[PDB]
Design a protein around this ligand. Structure first.
Ligand SMILES: Nc1ncnc2c1ncn2[C@@H]1O[C@H](COP(=O)(O)OP(=O)(O)NP(=O)(O)O)[C@@H](O)[C@H]1O
Ligand SMILES: Nc1ncnc2c1ncn2[C@@H]1O[C@H](COP(=O)(O)OP(=O)(O)NP(=O)(O)O)[C@@H](O)[C@H]1O
Lengths: 393, 393
């Protein structure tokens, strides 16, 4: 009964899951949070244990003691680490060696906060589990098949050639996992196929998958580009930002905080980054929440259609992520916004809750199949780890 | 034989044309340039006359003397002024009164350089021609039919409500003129129709026209958003810009210059902002020019498709502007990039030079008619002026 421990270190937290190799089902999940004076560990969402001014190593030894307690330690056959940004260096998941680590550090200036937390998790896990093989899965690697016409910014070439300024894209692990599930669900030939995947969660992005490969995506060098999101602006006119700076004497630094933390659904609505709250507000007559949601919809539609340009044929549009999986209303309003693509909704199918899992929501006359496919990044990570567990290292 | 004098004041220049009312054809055109120690007036592209350290008033009195010399002065029945930015205040062209002027000044912080030159032209013309009716035609007014879901940025509401931060769009006069010509050329019912117009000139933008009204457009609060252009970046990840600032210690001000003046086709190519030079470079083996053009194409395709989302049906795609009118290659590569919309090119029609004027370039099996329609902003301005010449003021 081997298991895979999957580790995701964020700015201030370590999320983990333990996956049964046989079912790839989750056996245990948890978080060490406020990594702050108030650091705590909650497992299966329960009884926060207090951690000190604990660093990532201490917190992971804690998680490791929780596994020891449950007699899982010796079952840990593989450990998979989620890495935020792999640059142009990583095009697929890898066995972690010293070389891999040095290379993660090399790309780390592209996502300074996140990648340094990912490296702390790797260091801690290597120290705690030296005889277990560990694997790195990058949230950017699926997008490394974009052609330069799709990844270049229209900035001077030197920004690309000497600083790595280009579109990278994110949610790679979700877009990959969902597109693979789509070839089955839609019965498409992977090698002759065109899909658009809309990952709509707290972060949101669109990916165009042509013949199995990502050929366009909505997020940029950073996760700020593309779709408007919960608290993130999405696409914003650089001119407008510069004009706002001059007009308010905000520095680039102020503006960075605004567009990340105060914008999007929260910024428009004045109310919440949470979609269910904004729907309830709209039901109660709140016009700015209505407008926040309409705008969110419009931007999704606009990106889905624009990503279709990278395809030779459009076979399917797939919704995923917390919003994409659960919002009956978002889906319907997006699809109605894409009538120009010949889409038809089956409103019976569309009303089904997410307990129904992988499901077709377009009606028979539709020109493009529409579906909902729940994403499972943990599983995708465990699958790569299992595969890499068969090789010599 | 009345004529309309059409005036366009830029940052450093006054462009003008004199249009025969009867033919709406141009009788004379010219520029006062370097408005700099070296200020000169060239008419019909000829013999620069030297102007002093001449202000806009002096330069216009010069143009007026050139008209006096040719016995046109008393023919000037209308004067039309091109205004860069009308904010949310102007939804159509207007007879210039004191109120109009005050309102242009009110929106002028949105395009400080340009609108102040436009106001100088208006002041000068009012002083030189007090008994001639004058009309203001705004490059943003056609876009004032955008719904909030299409014009709002995902920024805090206060930026919109208290500073007018929203998408405005530009080339309005061209998008309007070309869409009107398209209903004739394509024999479409204006009231039940969906068009995408690609204005590809030095500046470039896309406009979606639904039932006669602009419902989406690619430029933003400023002309910097959207399509990559000659020297302008187009859409760029705000995160990438902030990262570049921090990494190079450039200020917002440096970056503003980069994305306006050093980016786009010039920035990628390292060579020219000029498309014909980049094509010649590509023919000679230059890979960065190839990449600049491919990227320009890709971004056009991506915006055309994304603007289609705002339409209930797509009937036509119309190319216009210097590039759109003359580049056989750009058109073909864009249309090939939109195969997913069921487009078919008639490569015989597409090869025709622009002397052929309004022309269909898609082939019979096409799902969407494709056309080239030369834009004529001077004419559109003169038509509004002529219409407004019939009213009481
Ligand atoms: N029934 C529902 N209706 C609408 N929104 C919902 C519903 N349930 C969950 N959500 C939304 O899901 C959003 C959070 O999405 P999330 O859980 O982040 O998906 P994800 O797959 O984790 N994407 P990311 O966090 O960027 O990797 C919140 O705005 C919730 O309101
Ligand atoms: N035969 C040609 N092939 C390719 N490009 C051409 C050709 N002729 C002119 N152009 C391009 O037209 C571009 C200038 O476009 P422009 O003359 O500005 O159109 P416009 O209608 O004035 N748009 P704007 O200036 O933004 O209002 C240059 O890059 C030229 O190379």
């Amino acid at each position: 009964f081997p298991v895979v421990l999957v580790i995701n270190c964020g700015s201030s937290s370590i999320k983990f899951s333990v996956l049964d190799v046989a079912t790839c089902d989750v056996l245990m999940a948890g978080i060490a949070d406020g990594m702050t004076e108030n650091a705590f560990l909650s497992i299966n969402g329960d009884k926060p244990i207090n951690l000190a001014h604990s660093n990532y190593e201490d917190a992971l030894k804690a998680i490791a003691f929780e596994l020891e307690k449950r007699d899982l330690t010796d079952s840990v056959a593989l450990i998979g680490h989620r890495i935020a940004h792999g640059g142009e260096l990583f095009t697929q998941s890898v066995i972690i060696t010293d070389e891999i680590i040095d290379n993660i550090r090399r790309v780390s200036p592209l996502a300074p906060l996140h990648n340094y937390a990912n490296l702390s998790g790797i260091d801690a896990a290597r120290h705690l589990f030296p005889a277990v093989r560990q694997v790195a899965v990058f949230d950017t690697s699926f997008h490394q098949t974009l052609a330069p016409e799709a990844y270049l910014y229209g900035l001077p070439w030197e920004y690309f050639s000497s600083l790595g300024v280009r579109r990278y894209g994110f949610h790679g692990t979700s877009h990959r996992y969902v597109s693979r599930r789509a070839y089955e669900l839609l019965d498409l030939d992977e090698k002759d196929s065109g899909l658009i995947v809309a990952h709509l969660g707290n972060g949101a992005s669109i990916c165009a998958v042509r013949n199995g490969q990502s050929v366009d995506t909505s997020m940029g060098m950073t996760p700020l580009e593309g779709l408007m999101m919960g608290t993130r602006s999405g696409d914003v006119d650089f001119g407008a930002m510069a004009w706002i700076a001059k007009e308010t004497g905000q520095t680039l630094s102020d503006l960075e905080r605004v567009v990340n933390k105060e914008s999007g659904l929260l910024g428009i609505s004045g109310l919440s980054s949470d979609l269910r709250v904004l729907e309830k507000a709209w039901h109660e007559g709140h016009e700015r929440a209505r407008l926040a949601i309409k705008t969110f919809v419009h931007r999704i539609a606009r990106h889905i259609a624009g990503h279709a340009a990278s395809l030779h044929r459009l076979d399917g549009i797939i919704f995923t992520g917390g919003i994409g999986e659960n919002s009956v209303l978002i889906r319907q309003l997006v699809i109605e916004h894409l009538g120009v693509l010949g889409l038809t909704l089956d409103v019976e199918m569309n009303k089904q809750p997410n307990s129904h899992g992988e499901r077709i929501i377009s009606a028979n006359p539709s020109q493009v199949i529409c579906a909902v496919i729940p994403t499972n990044e943990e599983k995708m990570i465990a699958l790569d780890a299992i595969h890499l567990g068969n090789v010599k290292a």
